[PDB]
Amino acid sequence: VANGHLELIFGWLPLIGELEGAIEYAELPDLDFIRCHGLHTLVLQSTPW
RNA sequence: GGGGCGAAAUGGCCUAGACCAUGCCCCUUGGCAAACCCAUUCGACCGGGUUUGGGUCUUCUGACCUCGUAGUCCGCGCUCAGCGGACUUCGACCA
């Protein structure tokens, strides 16, 4: 068992490499941008003709 | 029907921009003020119709009553009427 478990953990080690790589990939700081608009108005006056 | 708008109320588009949907802004013109007419308790009774409504001389151009609108010099004096008065213009059934 002392040798089998050691072999097993040594074989498991590489997978932790790509797992930590993916973890780091999840922390990549990226983003986009947002942009909006708006408009308000007001009548001034009016007369007949 | 004829138009307007993307403004303005929001929704697509929505650095920005210009277009879209419902969606919202107006016309359905209006007024004449007078004179006369019906059937009848053989007028009281409301409603309708006709002739006029700035106006004439040649209302053709153009002028003669009237005014309205302006611009220009104006008298500080000359003419019997007097006066405050001159010249040029456009309009004249009414909003």
How crowded is the C-beta side of A26, counted as CA atoms within 13 Å?
6
Nucleotide nearest to A37 (CA to C1'): B14
Q: Residue A33: what are its φ and ψ, rounded to 5°?
A: -140, 155
CA A26 – CA A33 distance, rounded (Å): 20
Label residues A16-47 b or e (16+ Cβ within 10 Å = b).
eeeeeeeeeeeeeeeeeeeeeeeeeeeeeeee
Nucleotide nearest to A35 (CA to C1'): B15
Technique behind this structure?
Answer: cryo-EM
For A12, counting Cβ atoms within 10 Å of its Cβ (0-12 exposed, 13-18 middle, 19+ buried), the class is exposed
The integer distance in angstroms from the CA atom of A15 to the C1' atom of B34 is 116
**Residue A49 three-state SS:** coil
Resolution in A: 3.9
Q: How far is CA A14 from the centre of its chain?
A: 26
